Design a binder for these strands. Sequence first.
DNA 1: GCGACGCTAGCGTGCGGCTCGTC
DNA 2: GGACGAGCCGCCGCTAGCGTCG
Lengths: 759, 749
Amino acid sequence: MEGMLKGEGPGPLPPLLQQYVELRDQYPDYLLLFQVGDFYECFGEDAERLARALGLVLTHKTSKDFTTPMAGIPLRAFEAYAERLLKMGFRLAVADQVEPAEEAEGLVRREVTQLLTPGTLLQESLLPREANYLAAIATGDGWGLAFLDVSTGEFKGTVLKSKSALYDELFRHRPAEVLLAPELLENGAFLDEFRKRFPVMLSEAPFEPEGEGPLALRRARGALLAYAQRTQGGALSLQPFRFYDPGAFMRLPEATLRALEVFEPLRGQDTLFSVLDETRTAPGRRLLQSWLRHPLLDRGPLEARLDRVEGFVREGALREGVRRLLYRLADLERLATRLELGRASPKDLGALRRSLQILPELRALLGEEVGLPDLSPLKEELEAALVEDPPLKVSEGGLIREGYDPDLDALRAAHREGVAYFLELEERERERTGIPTLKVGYNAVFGYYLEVTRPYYERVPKEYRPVQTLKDRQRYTLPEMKEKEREVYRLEALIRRREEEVFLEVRERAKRQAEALREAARILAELDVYAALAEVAVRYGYVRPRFGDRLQIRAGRHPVVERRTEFVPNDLEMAHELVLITGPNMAGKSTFLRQTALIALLAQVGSFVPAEEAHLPLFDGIYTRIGAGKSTFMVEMEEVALILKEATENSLVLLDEVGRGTSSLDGVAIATAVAEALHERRAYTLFATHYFELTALGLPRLKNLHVAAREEAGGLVFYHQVLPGPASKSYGVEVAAMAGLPKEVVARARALLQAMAAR
Amino acid sequence: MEGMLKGEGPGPLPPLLQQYVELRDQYPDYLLLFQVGDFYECFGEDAERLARALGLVLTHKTSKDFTTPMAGIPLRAFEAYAERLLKMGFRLAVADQVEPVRREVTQLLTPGTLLQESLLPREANYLAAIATGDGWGLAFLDVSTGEFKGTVLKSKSALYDELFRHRPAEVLLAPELLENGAFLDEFRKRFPVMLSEAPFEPEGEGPLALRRARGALLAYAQRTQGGALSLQPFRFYDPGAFMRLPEATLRALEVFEPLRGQDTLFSVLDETRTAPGRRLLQSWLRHPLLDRGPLEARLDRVEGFVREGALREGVRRLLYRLADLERLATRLELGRASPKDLGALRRSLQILPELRALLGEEVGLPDLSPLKEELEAALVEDPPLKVSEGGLIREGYDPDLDALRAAHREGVAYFLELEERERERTGIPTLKVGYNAVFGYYLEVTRPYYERVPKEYRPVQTLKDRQRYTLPEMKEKEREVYRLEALIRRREEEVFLEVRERAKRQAEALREAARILAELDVYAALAEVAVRYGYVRPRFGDRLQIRAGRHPVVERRTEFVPNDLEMAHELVLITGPNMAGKSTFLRQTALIALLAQVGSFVPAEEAHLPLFDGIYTRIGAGKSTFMVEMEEVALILKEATENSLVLLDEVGRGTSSLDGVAIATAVAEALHERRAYTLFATHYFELTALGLPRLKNLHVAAREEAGGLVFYHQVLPGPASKSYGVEVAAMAGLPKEVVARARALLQAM
DNA sequence: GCGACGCTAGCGTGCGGCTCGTC
DNA sequence: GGACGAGCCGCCGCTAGCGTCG
Ligand SMILES: Nc1ncnc2c1ncn2[C@@H]1O[C@H](COP(=O)(O)OP(=O)(O)O)[C@@H](O)[C@H]1O
Ligand SMILES: Nc1ncnc2c1ncn2[C@@H]1O[C@H](COP(=O)(O)OP(=O)(O)O)[C@@H](O)[C@H]1O
Ligand SMILES: [Mg+2]
Ligand SMILES: [Mg+2]
């Protein structure tokens, strides 16, 4: 069994290392960072792991019995080192010195304070402005999926019917760590797939049901709570759990977010989110992100969002003011959570004090209608307790302002006089001794001292007690000092105790406003998004969309592509119609399709869009078969299947070249059947194809569009006007030629084309 | 800004920072790493970068009149941060404190001029330079090996190819190229690699563009290896004297790098035991042979080891981990060999005698026993390049050093007697005798014994729990131990240098040895591979006949189905359902031809192959895919000859079905008239019936087992007659109605 | 016939703070 | 001869090695 360390030598394991091993084997998959004084240490193989991983120095901690390896890092840089460690895939186990040193039974009590897992981080410097989720998956009456953001207390979940739905929901939440129920873990089949589709870190957790609701949900939830409660090291700060239904929002499968690069790019470029987000606060960015993850289906609320955006679009003054003020607004939502968790540092409070000072200016600028909570009381006491620049930890320098604590002002009082003492003494001795240069100094090793140079050694009085000798200086001590020096240490010792109590007192003060802090967070976050979305409209020429059943876009453009090129706007009118798009490659087909979806996606999120006039219907979902079964034809077909099994007459469907990847024959066949299917379905379907046949089909709601090329001076020039009607001819041979194909080879091709044309 | 440091305050740069800025300003395009004690430091704006790029602790360097930000890395950790910093596109200038307030630029770390082993791969590491004149000038240099070669290319297309065969680490474009905005905009896009500036004043003879490129390399590399370079005679070569292997083919075939999803022809194939070997073999794969004479000679050598298993196994054992004599030689020649190097060298020399026993005089290895006896006589059984430079020469090697070390030791003894003797008079069995730079030697007494501390003493320094004293009869014996510790350094370094020099006088013998072993290593390894995976010796002749050939890389991962092929300047179409094996087949055919013309055995039973002049592929995936594919095709049509192996994989796709078949037919014809060995996997059954005299059909098929379709991987003769598109959409999950509708449509046509 | 305490010099990650030599 | 390198001690805690309770 386990209970031994890697150290060479016989005899027993020292009292400390003993305590080290005792905790180290309770968290087998965590790198244990042992708190020994002002350093975090690791011994044995664990010490080696560290040294190399962090380039630290490898040393040893020798004892009578044996000698083991040692590696440590100064607490000062804990987080600094933590971050690096986490990014490599380690779970950290922080074992701290619980009870103080001065009052310990020899060996100071040490226990694991917190656990640092990628999906349960609370450390602000270790978190992105974005939401950080822990996700739990379980079975038992369908698929159970739950998320928890330990830093904000967001706690939500649902139950999905298919393995497909689960993966979609999971992929739109971008979980940073996943807990898999017993069943799924065992099943090597599933695990492979999951591990392959979501390269996220996996972790073990007990899936004992918790609360009420579908068995599956209760298990995932419990798993979350079980795990998080363990890494936090105490009760968690949870928000009302949301058992939500993804059927209430617009469907955005994984293939759509990916193909549309809503959150992640295909080529280290921009994404819809990067381009759209100009929020100033972190909760703001989170809100916006949340909105994109689940676009609304309901006209009313979307119109509500659009009014508030339009508001700031008009009030440029106001809009720039609110944004000018939010630049300084801290993550209240997270701060409120750190407080409730009794983790708030003086850094946090200083931050809180600044944010709260912005409130009243926002109140004035927008009016008392914003609903902002009145924290003026809290804000003030903070300004009256904290230094203009709050230090990191309490025991060190001044944290509380002078004049705030009667008990503490008397302490700095006594300390000031006490220090002055030694100053007075200097002059008294420089006289009695007649030694002009006589200094009075201090230092950790010997305490307060009287210093005298060599030229005056024979001039030093009997009374002086030697304490330290240097190259050409000697240091003495009088009895008076010895006393007054301990009066100073007592003070200093009392000054810390109190300064920290006052801090803790004031903190708890802010902790009773946590909920108020939370609601200001929400209000100010919406404020942030509304102004940001407006900022984006103004800067990039977007307009307010109008909803209805007919889609009529005028001068629409791709929101991301136009960011890096003179983009030629285009129009579109659809209505449960089947719109085929033909024309030469490099002309614009694929970009046109993508442009259409993004516009729809932006509108149904409440943002203005990249067009001159945009009348949009409320799509129940955006489905795509763009870009991307051993074969390609099979992979593309599997997608058409999915798209075909969920599209409704209220779905925006975008097909790009469906039918490619096989025989010309099965090509047209499949494409035709498919195009007929989506036609019957009655969804809004944009199909970019190379089978001119599909354009001639005998369908009642079939419309035709095309892009074109003009064979000019230097070959072929592709314009991007998406003109009405079908494409006339294909430009393959022409392109081949342009590509450099030997002139005879091309001419032979033209002859073959014209021969087959002759029937 | 020269003399300017990013900081706050008026007053001049203190003495130190003044020095720093003086060097910093000498190597502008580089990040200057300044030595300060046990760290490499950066100041001002540079410190901010270093801190940024490595995420370090920004702090400040303060003097009365100026404070500037600083950040640094431990002198030790150096080579580890250098790597991160290099990979990030950083060029490094190292400034070391000349072994005892004085600093200078020792090295210049650069992607394509690296000399430090821990920063180099087993493979060659080139610095390339491209210039212009009548045709392109390409020249490669590998400062760690001395390899110096070049050629003159006619087409920018051929340029890129040679540039890619070599995978340079750093490129130097002449000024005409750097100013040509279109080229540079293209070069970066197609060749993501660090581009450096460098003078191009011609050097030597031959074409103007070559001499110029050659000069850039020489001039630039010397700046790096601060002085004369160690280089073997410049080798001018002709890409036309070897089998052509263009970037398209190298990538398509994954000779050196995978399309992601590991395993290259090279990894599978590579089984060498030394770096020179790995380099040799890579060199061969890089330029396959045309001439049967040499090829048959290589195959002869390979067979030698396939027969002599005892020999093969005995040689691969001895070579295990054997050092890189070629690089070692170069470091010695450059005057950069570390004591650790000399130690590695002696180990290598010790093994050399054994290899000669096994092989024999035939081989021609040099007898270096004398150098090996020397190295065994002077070096400790573990030289330490890092540990000072002391504890380097062993006892009894050099009398002078020996006498000094002995005297020193006595001193230490004295300061061990003063200890035993004193506490044996003061009753303080605690009393210590330690030393410190500040005052030299001393006596150390703990707090308790101050009452038992005599007056013959003289305190010099007091500590928390103890105080250190002095004595009269102790100064001399200090000013002596030191005068020696110094001399021991002075002398030991002399001997080390003397010894290092003897090793350096055997540079050629080392290079000659390295080279021979490299061949032996390669032949013996190509033998090992043939014996393990069952490769056969190929035969050369105007007809291609392969009996049961397998894709060499693919098979190491699954049960492979071998196949046959009989070509002869014919157009061989391959139809059949996707997922059956068309693309793999073309590729195995190509890899086999490659292994053969490299002098390796091949993955088959019988392989009679023609000596192709080049293998041109068109396989796999602002510009439409179609246009890119056509450009590749145009390349082949302008290159392929009747002795070329051309592999067309579904050419024609990416456009209309008409233009598709039309283009595809015109190409198939052009290659037919060309008379090259063409394997054309297509979906256009039209090609299958062109009826050309040298056209031929082959296809793969699929059965309808259990649920849907199972693809057998057998390449049968003649064309396929079906397409399983609809059959596949069915398995894909397409709604039965849509599937049925498709079938109705299919037939209806 | 030896378990149990007490006193206390000393080491050691990374790194302020203190000292000292040179001018 | 006030200021600038250049380098050693010790932090906070635990231990081992010594005396000693009796
Ligand atoms: N409306 C447009 N305005 C400006 N550039 C466009 C437009 N549509 C396409 N492009 C350009 O054409 C290139 C892409 O071809 P694309 O139109 O997507 O493919 P195709 O027409 O082959 O489906 C894009 O990278 C972009 O630079
Ligand atoms: N000779 C073979 N033996 C075993 N598997 C093979 C063989 N040739 C091909 N395959 C299989 O086919 C896959 C590749 O199909 P591929 O060669 O690309 O066929 P195609 O181009 O007709 O789609 C391989 O990864 C493997 O699964
Ligand atoms: Mg396209
Ligand atoms: Mg294929």
